[PDB]
Coordinates of all heavy atoms in Angstrom, one line a residue:
Chain A
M1178 N 50.4 12.2 3.6 CA 50.3 13.4 4.3 C 51.0 14.5 3.6 O 52.1 14.3 3.1 CB 51.0 13.2 5.7 CG 50.9 14.4 6.7 SD 51.9 14.2 8.1 CE 53.6 14.5 7.5
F1194 N 56.7 -2.6 3.4 CA 57.4 -2.0 2.2 C 58.0 -0.7 2.7 O 57.8 -0.1 3.8 CB 56.4 -1.5 1.1 CG 55.8 -2.8 0.4 CD1 54.7 -3.4 1.0 CD2 56.2 -3.1 -0.8 CE1 54.1 -4.4 0.3 CE2 55.7 -4.2 -1.5 CZ 54.6 -4.9 -0.9
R1207 N 58.8 -10.1 0.0 CA 59.0 -10.7 -1.3 C 58.6 -12.2 -1.2 O 57.9 -12.8 -2.1 CB 60.5 -10.7 -1.7 CG 61.0 -9.3 -1.9 CD 62.4 -9.2 -2.4 NE 62.9 -8.0 -2.8 CZ 62.6 -7.4 -4.1 NH1 61.9 -8.1 -4.9 NH2 63.0 -6.2 -4.3
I1222 N 39.9 -23.9 -5.5 CA 40.2 -25.0 -4.7 C 39.0 -25.3 -3.7 O 38.5 -26.4 -3.6 CB 41.5 -24.8 -3.7 CG1 42.7 -24.9 -4.6 CG2 41.6 -25.8 -2.7 CD1 44.0 -24.3 -4.0
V1233 N 37.4 -33.6 4.9 CA 37.7 -32.4 5.7 C 36.7 -32.1 6.6 O 36.8 -31.9 7.8 CB 38.2 -31.2 4.9 CG1 38.3 -29.9 5.7 CG2 39.6 -31.5 4.2
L1239 N 40.3 -30.6 11.6 CA 40.6 -30.0 10.3 C 39.6 -29.0 9.9 O 40.1 -27.9 9.3 CB 40.8 -31.2 9.2 CG 41.9 -30.9 8.2 CD1 43.2 -30.4 8.8 CD2 42.1 -32.1 7.4
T1249 N 40.8 -15.2 10.2 CA 41.9 -14.4 10.6 C 42.4 -13.6 9.4 O 42.6 -12.3 9.5 CB 43.0 -15.1 11.3 OG1 43.4 -16.4 10.5 CG2 42.7 -15.6 12.7
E1301 N 35.0 15.9 -15.6 CA 33.7 15.4 -15.1 C 33.6 13.9 -15.3 O 34.1 13.4 -16.3 CB 32.5 16.1 -15.7 CG 32.4 17.6 -15.6 CD 31.8 18.0 -14.2
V1312 N 24.7 0.1 -18.9 CA 25.3 -1.1 -18.5 C 24.6 -1.7 -17.2 O 24.9 -2.8 -16.9 CB 26.8 -0.9 -18.1 CG1 27.7 -0.6 -19.4 CG2 27.1 0.1 -17.0
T1343 N 20.7 4.6 6.9 CA 21.4 6.0 6.5 C 20.5 7.0 7.1 O 19.2 7.0 6.9 CB 21.5 6.0 5.0 OG1 22.4 4.9 4.6 CG2 22.2 7.3 4.5
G1354 N 22.0 3.6 12.8 CA 22.4 2.4 13.6 C 23.7 2.6 14.4 O 24.8 2.1 14.0
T1396 N -0.1 -3.1 16.2 CA -0.3 -2.0 15.3 C 0.4 -0.7 15.8 O 0.8 -0.6 16.9 CB -1.8 -1.7 15.2 OG1 -2.3 -1.2 16.5 CG2 -2.6 -2.8 14.8
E1453 N 11.7 -18.9 38.3 CA 12.1 -17.8 39.2 C 12.4 -16.5 38.5 O 12.5 -15.5 39.1 CB 13.3 -18.3 40.1 CG 14.6 -18.3 39.6 CD 14.9 -19.4 38.4 OE1 14.0 -20.2 38.1 OE2 16.1 -19.4 38.0
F1488 N 33.6 -26.8 1.3 CA 33.9 -26.6 2.7 C 32.7 -26.1 3.5 O 32.1 -25.2 3.2 CB 35.1 -25.7 3.0 CG 35.5 -25.5 4.4 CD1 35.9 -26.6 5.2 CD2 35.4 -24.2 4.9 CE1 36.2 -26.3 6.6 CE2 35.7 -24.0 6.3 CZ 36.1 -25.0 7.1
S1543 N -1.8 -6.7 3.4 CA -2.9 -7.4 3.1 C -2.5 -8.8 2.3 O -3.1 -9.8 2.5 CB -4.0 -6.8 2.2 OG -4.3 -5.5 2.7
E1555 N 6.6 -21.1 1.1 CA 6.7 -22.0 0.1 C 6.9 -21.3 -1.3 O 7.7 -21.8 -2.2 CB 5.3 -22.8 0.0 CG 5.1 -23.8 1.2 CD 3.9 -24.6 1.1 OE1 2.9 -24.2 0.5 OE2 3.8 -25.6 1.8
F1557 N 8.2 -18.2 -1.9 CA 9.5 -17.5 -2.0 C 10.7 -18.6 -2.1 O 11.7 -18.3 -2.6 CB 9.7 -16.5 -0.9 CG 8.9 -15.2 -1.1 CD1 8.7 -14.4 0.0 CD2 8.5 -14.8 -2.4 CE1 7.9 -13.2 -0.1 CE2 7.7 -13.7 -2.5 CZ 7.4 -12.8 -1.4
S1586 N 27.6 8.0 -3.9 CA 29.0 7.7 -3.9 C 29.9 8.8 -4.3 O 31.0 9.0 -3.7 CB 29.3 6.6 -4.9 OG 28.7 5.3 -4.5
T1607 N 43.5 -3.6 -15.5 CA 44.3 -2.9 -16.5 C 43.5 -2.4 -17.7 O 44.0 -1.8 -18.6 CB 45.5 -3.7 -16.9 OG1 45.2 -5.1 -17.3 CG2 46.5 -3.8 -15.8
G1667 N 33.0 -10.0 15.6 CA 33.2 -8.7 16.4 C 32.0 -8.3 17.0 O 31.7 -7.0 17.0

Side-chain angles (χ1 to χ4, degrees), chain A residues 1178 1194 1207 1222 1233 1239 1249 1312 1343 1354 1396 1453 1488 1543 1555 1557 1586 1607 1667:
Chain A
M1178 181 187 76
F1194 294 82
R1207 298 185 167 281
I1222 291 171
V1233 168
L1239 212 47
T1249 48
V1312 296
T1343 302
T1396 66
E1453 79 285 5
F1488 176 64
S1543 311
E1555 290 180 339
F1557 290 156
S1586 293
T1607 49

